[PDB]
Design an enzyme around this catalytic site. Structure first.
Site, PDB file in Angstrom:
ATOM      1  N   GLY A  69       4.094  -6.914  -0.153  1.00  0.00           N
ATOM      2  CA  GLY A  69       4.576  -6.118  -1.266  1.00  0.00           C
ATOM      3  C   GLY A  69       4.370  -4.635  -1.034  1.00  0.00           C
TER       4      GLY A  69
ATOM      5  N   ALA B 195       2.860  -2.441  -2.796  1.00  0.00           N
ATOM      6  CA  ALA B 195       1.463  -2.097  -3.028  1.00  0.00           C
ATOM      7  C   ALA B 195       0.641  -2.327  -1.766  1.00  0.00           C
ATOM      8  CB  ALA B 195       0.900  -2.914  -4.181  1.00  0.00           C
TER       9      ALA B 195
ATOM     10  N   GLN C 132       1.759   0.088   1.174  1.00  0.00           N
ATOM     11  CA  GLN C 132       1.302   1.466   0.994  1.00  0.00           C
ATOM     12  C   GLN C 132      -0.219   1.566   1.128  1.00  0.00           C
ATOM     13  OE1 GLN C 132       3.093   2.287  -2.862  1.00  0.00           O
ATOM     14  NE2 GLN C 132       4.752   3.461  -1.909  1.00  0.00           N
TER      15      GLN C 132
ATOM     16  N   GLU D  35      12.151  -7.217   1.118  1.00  0.00           N
ATOM     17  CA  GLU D  35      13.168  -6.168   1.192  1.00  0.00           C
ATOM     18  C   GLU D  35      12.686  -5.071   2.140  1.00  0.00           C
ATOM     19  OE1 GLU D  35      13.729  -4.468  -2.653  1.00  0.00           O
ATOM     20  OE2 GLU D  35      11.584  -4.198  -3.035  1.00  0.00           O
TER      21      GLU D  35
ATOM     22  N   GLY E 149       6.264  -9.866  -7.923  1.00  0.00           N
ATOM     23  CA  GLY E 149       6.888 -11.096  -7.462  1.00  0.00           C
ATOM     24  C   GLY E 149       6.622 -11.428  -6.005  1.00  0.00           C
ATOM     25  N   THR E 150       6.969 -10.497  -5.120  1.00  0.00           N
ATOM     26  CA  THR E 150       6.810 -10.698  -3.684  1.00  0.00           C
ATOM     27  C   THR E 150       5.358 -10.983  -3.333  1.00  0.00           C
ATOM     28  OG1 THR E 150       8.675  -9.231  -3.145  1.00  0.00           O
ATOM     29  CG2 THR E 150       7.079  -9.679  -1.392  1.00  0.00           C
TER      30      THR E 150
ATOM     31  N   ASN F  40      -5.319  -0.084 -12.123  1.00  0.00           N
ATOM     32  CA  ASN F  40      -4.855   1.288 -11.926  1.00  0.00           C
ATOM     33  C   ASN F  40      -5.213   2.217 -13.086  1.00  0.00           C
ATOM     34  OD1 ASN F  40      -3.688   0.584  -9.454  1.00  0.00           O
ATOM     35  ND2 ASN F  40      -1.704   0.101 -10.391  1.00  0.00           N
TER      36      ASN F  40
ATOM     37  N   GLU G  66     -21.533 -13.387   4.518  1.00  0.00           N
ATOM     38  CA  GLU G  66     -22.682 -13.074   3.678  1.00  0.00           C
ATOM     39  C   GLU G  66     -22.219 -12.676   2.283  1.00  0.00           C
ATOM     40  OE1 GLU G  66     -25.465 -10.380   5.474  1.00  0.00           O
ATOM     41  OE2 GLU G  66     -25.005 -11.068   7.506  1.00  0.00           O
TER      42      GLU G  66
HETATM   43  N1  LIG Z   1      -2.779   0.752  -7.025  1.00  0.00           N
HETATM   44  C1  LIG Z   1      -1.504   0.644  -6.660  1.00  0.00           C
HETATM   45  N2  LIG Z   1      -0.709  -0.340  -7.214  1.00  0.00           N
HETATM   46  C2  LIG Z   1       0.590  -0.456  -6.847  1.00  0.00           C
HETATM   47  C3  LIG Z   1       1.135   0.411  -5.911  1.00  0.00           C
HETATM   48  N3  LIG Z   1       2.431   0.075  -5.732  1.00  0.00           N
HETATM   49  C4  LIG Z   1       2.717  -0.981  -6.528  1.00  0.00           C
HETATM   50  N4  LIG Z   1       1.589  -1.315  -7.231  1.00  0.00           N
HETATM   51  C5  LIG Z   1       1.468  -2.418  -8.201  1.00  0.00           C
HETATM   52  O1  LIG Z   1       2.610  -3.243  -8.091  1.00  0.00           O
HETATM   53  C6  LIG Z   1       3.179  -3.521  -9.352  1.00  0.00           C
HETATM   54  C7  LIG Z   1       4.697  -3.489  -9.237  1.00  0.00           C
HETATM   55  O2  LIG Z   1       5.166  -4.565  -8.452  1.00  0.00           O
HETATM   56  P1  LIG Z   1       5.203  -4.489  -6.842  1.00  0.00           P
HETATM   57  O3  LIG Z   1       3.878  -4.863  -6.226  1.00  0.00           O
HETATM   58  O4  LIG Z   1       5.630  -3.106  -6.411  1.00  0.00           O
HETATM   59  O5  LIG Z   1       6.337  -5.554  -6.431  1.00  0.00           O
HETATM   60  P2  LIG Z   1       7.140  -5.367  -5.049  1.00  0.00           P
HETATM   61  O6  LIG Z   1       6.195  -4.970  -3.941  1.00  0.00           O
HETATM   62  O7  LIG Z   1       8.235  -4.343  -5.221  1.00  0.00           O
HETATM   63  O8  LIG Z   1       7.775  -6.817  -4.752  1.00  0.00           O
HETATM   64  P3  LIG Z   1       8.799  -7.488  -5.798  1.00  0.00           P
HETATM   65  O9  LIG Z   1       8.041  -7.969  -7.012  1.00  0.00           O
HETATM   66  O10 LIG Z   1       9.495  -8.657  -5.144  1.00  0.00           O
HETATM   67  O11 LIG Z   1       9.819  -6.455  -6.208  1.00  0.00           O
HETATM   68  C8  LIG Z   1       2.660  -2.459 -10.306  1.00  0.00           C
HETATM   69  O12 LIG Z   1       2.278  -3.039 -11.531  1.00  0.00           O
HETATM   70  C9  LIG Z   1       1.452  -1.860  -9.615  1.00  0.00           C
HETATM   71  O13 LIG Z   1       0.272  -2.245 -10.280  1.00  0.00           O
HETATM   72  C10 LIG Z   1       0.342   1.402  -5.349  1.00  0.00           C
HETATM   73  O14 LIG Z   1       0.816   2.175  -4.519  1.00  0.00           O
HETATM   74  N5  LIG Z   1      -0.980   1.516  -5.726  1.00  0.00           N
HETATM   75 MG   LIG Z   2       9.005  -5.021  -3.387  1.00  0.00          MG
END
Ligand SMILES: Nc1nc2c(ncn2[C@@H]2O[C@H](COP(=O)(O)OP(=O)(O)OP(=O)(O)O)[C@@H](O)[C@H]2O)c(=O)[nH]1
Ligand SMILES: [Mg+2]
Ligand SMILES: Nc1nc2c(ncn2[C@@H]2O[C@H](COP(=O)(O)OP(=O)(O)O)[C@@H](O)[C@H]2O)c(=O)[nH]1
Lengths: 430, 426
Positions: free
Chosen positions: A10, A12, A15, A64, A137-138, A199, A247
């Site tokens: 994903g 998140a 990154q 994606e 989702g992913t 967050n 541990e």
């Molecule tokens: N702490 C933090 N959380 C993130 C970040 N990017 C996305 N998230 C978390 O991800 C959630 C959004 O969904 P994503 O994880 O981006 O989903 P995706 O990676 O686009 O994959 P899909 O669900 O298939 O679209 C948000 O509620 C955030 O909490 C980030 O850069 N830092």
């Molecule tokens: Mg995504």
């Protein structure tokens, strides 16, 4: 020898993975080109080729292309092996169904083979690190599936994951409860340990403590990266007390069904306050045990401490550490469960918490990484369960999931499991 | 990669489509000659979505133009951006439907939609991964409604799992550019209620009020309204065509925004909206945009959102912004506006942020709501349709085309079911 595979699923995870590997590269003095113009605990996280080019051990998976393409065009494109970057032609659309079932199943095999070969390269492989968003989702679906598969394949190998916890107030999507619940179901049934991060709590922490501008995901990911790097630093350098992931599994988990350590990091302060601030171990721990400094919005005072792990970096003397721990034990605002004589596991590492160039966090000669388990998180699970209960009670959005191959009894069973979790926390809380 | 097919219904579909492709050409830095003069890689990165690579390295926008009155398409070809489209994209009959839904749909759309469908299959074969189709049309127009209805039906028949969305011009409450509009709108809505994933409702009257009020205009024409609507239409697609945080795919947006299969109807909104010279007194911040977006006056659909409740809300941002600001604003707004949102849907907001702002502005945003104010719209349309249907006005044309009364009856029944379903959740 001792090695670990870092999975990123994903946006998140990707990154956070980017920031993480950047921080690793900083700590190991490695350049984006794999060149490094005592530290073999870097070979723990890295491999090496004929030219002395160091490559990270990881697998990036996004259904994606998106951020992974952004990474392919990024600075570290020269670092990561092109094979480690795996992209599909479309997303999970915040739908657990697709990622866990419909889409990821046509992808994940490649990822499994990839991880397998990466594991074949390993000698002493200890475990894994899975970075993903909780409710996305992913991340949700694919990490659930992947965790199941890896759980079957690798067995006793340590499975750790960092899940971004959905906030109580702010939300990036309406369907987060479903995904989160299905996730915690299938994930609870497998994952050995899961670190929860909110967050909103990070916003609170940085804004109130770090005293910066209203931030973006960058510095947040940097903070979490610092935490993770601190743990791995506990593993990646020779300290007075060295701590294996096993541990952590041993000490932090009282029961197989309950693992949800809450991360809190100190010191968190502005570069300006650093001069007026005097950091002592006792003071840092005092800051660590404050509820406002938690990376989750969960209030600790609504529950009791079961297990607490404190990882120290840089210059620290265990004498004043145990003294500080005693001083902390003397505090009755912080209460521990009756059947636990001591919930403290300590570790120390001579390697200080280096700061990221262009970073907003103050440079310090020491830092503390805290991991803790409490039932207030069960309260958090309760509110999430309530949200899910309502949204499911009105059968909102269910047609997607159902049409994509899910079932009502599935959600029901997940709910039942959540109830069981709640009652487990309740019973253990007694 | 992810690719979208843009189908343009006759008349306003083609006009709006022209302005739309102008906007897109500006977005990716595509010269009307077809050559790429853009200075950025992000422009050419995902460009394959709306464009194809010619052997001459001219970028052909992916679209299919359909009208029963060639004059409009001739005016399109005479336009500067008519050169971008290949001559094959122009498909038309020589006899207009004359605002007759049944005529076009049952008679004059079939041949043309067959040809168009062939071209669609070609464009679909040209796709690596087809995300879906988008249709620019009008409710109440013969060609748009009839041909759009038939075409969309067949497109779903061929491509059931693909994303089906449409930007439709809804009938104005206090004014009308044509009679018989309720019939056409009703039939079109019916088939569009069953056959699509989602649709957007935009009324020209509300646009006139909005633009005149906020932009302080004098003699605005359809081009400006089309410019705005196209800005929105381009606005919603930014996360696909550019990198950012919380990138939102169209189907993901469709999933988030649609709580139930039959209610997909959305009311778009846009910010910042400010007149020249008044901009100097305006500070661009997330609060500003959010306050403009959640203002009832800025709703491009004709209705008052104050009567109803929001089932789902999606807000997409453009440019460099702070997540904290957005979150805080969404929470605060949702907090103070409580009772305007559904109680059984916690966290009604859906957030997405693109790092690339629209050209000319430092930042921008687009609002997509879902509310029963559209039920009010449907009440109005139903009432008008009933009034007209009672006395059998203009019916002879449609019956002449072989349109049975039971179809109108069933359509009305479905509309009743629709507004009923809207009343059921509230
Ligand atoms: N702490 C933090 N959380 C993130 C970040 N990017 C996305 N998230 C978390 O991800 C959630 C959004 O969904 P994503 O994880 O981006 O989903 P995706 O990676 O686009 O994959 P899909 O669900 O298939 O679209 C948000 O509620 C955030 O909490 C980030 O850069 N830092
Ligand atoms: Mg995504
Ligand atoms: N927004 C917008 N709406 C338009 C434009 N041109 C026509 N319309 C709308 O389309 C309706 C006319 O329908 P029309 O397409 O001529 O019917 P048809 O020729 O039988 O398909 C009117 O109610 C207008 O509101 C335009 O340029 N912009």
């Amino acid at each position: 020898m001792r090695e670990c595979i870092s999975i990123h699923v994903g946006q998140a995870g990707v990154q956070i993975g980017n920031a993480c590997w950047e921080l690793y590269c900083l700590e190991h003095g490695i350049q984006p080109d794999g060149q490094m113009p005592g530290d073999d605990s870097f070979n723990t996280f890295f491999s090496e080729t004929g030219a002395g080019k160091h490559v990270p051990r990881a697998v990036f998976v996004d259904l994606e292309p998106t951020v992974i393409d952004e990474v392919r065009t990024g600075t570290y494109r020269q670092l990561f092996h092109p094979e480690q970057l795996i992209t599909g032609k479309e997303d999970a659309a915040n739908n657990y169904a697709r990622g866990h079932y419909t889409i990821g199943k046509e992808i994940i095999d490649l990822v499994l083979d990839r991880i397998r070969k990466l594991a074949d390269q390993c000698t002493g492989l200890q475990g894994f690190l899975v970075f993903h968003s909780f409710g996305g989702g992913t991340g949700s679906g694919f990490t659930s599936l992947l965790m199941e598969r890896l759980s079957v394949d690798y067995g006793k190998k340590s499975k750790l994951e960092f899940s971004i916890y959905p906030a109580p107030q702010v939300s990036t999507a309406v369907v987060e409860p479903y995904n989160s619940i299905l996730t915690t179901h299938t994930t609870l049934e497998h994952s050995d340990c899961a670190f929860m991060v909110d967050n909103e709590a990070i916003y609170d922490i940085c804004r109130r403590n770090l005293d910066i501008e209203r931030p973006t995901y960058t510095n947040l990911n940097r903070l979490i990266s610092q935490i993770v790097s601190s743990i791995t630093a506990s593993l990646r350098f020779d300290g007075a007390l060295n701590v294996d992931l096993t541990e952590f599994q041993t000490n932090l988990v009282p029961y197989p069904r309950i693992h949800f350590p809450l991360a809190t990091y100190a010191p968190v302060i502005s570069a300006e306050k650093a001069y007026h601030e005097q950091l002592s171990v006792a003071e840092i721990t005092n800051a660590c045990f404050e509820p406002a400094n938690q990376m989750v919005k969960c209030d600790p005072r609504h529950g009791k401490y079961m297990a607490c792990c404190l990882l120290y970096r840089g210059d620290v003397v265990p004498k004043d550490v145990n003294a500080a721990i005693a001083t902390i034990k003397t505090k009755r605002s912080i209460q521990f469960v009756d059947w636990c004589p001591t919930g403290f596991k300590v570790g120390i590492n001579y390697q200080p918490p280096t700061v990221v160039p262009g970073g907003d966090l103050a440079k310090v000669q020491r830092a503390v990484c805290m991991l803790s388990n409490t039932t207030a998180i069960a309260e958090a699970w309760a509110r999430l369960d309530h949200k899910f209960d309502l949204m499911y009670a009105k059968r909102a959005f269910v047609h997607w999931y159902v049409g994509e191959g899910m079932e009502e009894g599935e959600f029901s069973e997940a709910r039942e499991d959540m109830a069981a979790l709640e009652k487990d926390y309740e019973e253990v809380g007694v | 990669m992810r690719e979208i097919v843009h189908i343009q219904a006759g008349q306003c579909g083609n006009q709006i489509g022209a302005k739309f492709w102008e906007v897109i050409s500006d977005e990716h830095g595509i010269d009307p000659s077809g050559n790429y003069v853009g200075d950025s890689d992000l422009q050419l990165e995902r460009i394959s979505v709306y464009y194809n690579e010619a052997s001459s390295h001219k970028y052909v926008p992916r679209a299919i133009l359909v009208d029963l009155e060639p004059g409009t398409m001739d005016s399109v070809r005479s336009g500067a951006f008519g050169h971008l489209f290949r001559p094959d994209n122009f498909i038309f009959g020589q006899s207009g439907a004359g605002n007759n839904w049944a005529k076009g749909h049952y008679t004059e759309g079939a041949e043309l939609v067959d040809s168009v469908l062939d071209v669609v299959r070609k464009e679909c074969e040209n796709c690596d991964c087809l995300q879906g189709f988008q249709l620019t049309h009008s409710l109440g127009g013969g060609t748009g409604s009839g041909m759009g209805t038939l075409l969309i039906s067949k497109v779903r028949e061929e491509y059931p799992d693909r994303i089906m969305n449409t930007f439709s011009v809804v009938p104005s409450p206090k004014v009308s550019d044509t009679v018989v509009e309720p019939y056409n709108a009703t039939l079109s809505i019916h088939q569009l209620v069953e056959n699509t994933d989602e649709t957007y409702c935009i009324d020209n009257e509300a646009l006139y009020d909005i633009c005149f009020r906020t932009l302080k205009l004098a003699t605005p024409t359809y081009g400006d309204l089309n410019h705005l609507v196209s800005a929105t239409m381009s606005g919603v697609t930014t996360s696909l065509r550019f990198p950012g945080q919380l990138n939102a795919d169209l189907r993901k947006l469709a999933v988030n925004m649609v709580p139930f299969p039959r209610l997909h109807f959305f009311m778009p909104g846009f910010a910042p909206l400010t007149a020249r010279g008044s901009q100097q007194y305006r500070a661009l911040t997330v609060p500003e945009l959010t306050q403009q977006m959640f203002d009832a006056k800025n709703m491009m659909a004709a209705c008052d959102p104050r009567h109803g409740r929001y089932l789902t809300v999606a807000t997409v941002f453009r440019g460099r912004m702070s997540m904290k600001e957005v979150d805080e604003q969404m929470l605060a707004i949702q907090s103070k506006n409580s009772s305007y949102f559904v109680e059984w849907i916690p966290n009604n907001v859906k957030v997405a942020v693109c790092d690339i702002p629209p050209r000319g502005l430092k930042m921008s945003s687009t609002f997509i709501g879902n509310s029963t104010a559209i039920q009010e719209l449907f009440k109005r349309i139903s009432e008008q349709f009933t009034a007209m249907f009672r006395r059998k006005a203009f019916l002879h044309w449609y019956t002449g085309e072989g349109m049975d009364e039971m179809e109108f009856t069933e359509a009305e029944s479905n509309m009743n079911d629709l507004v009923s379903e809207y009343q059921q959740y509230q």
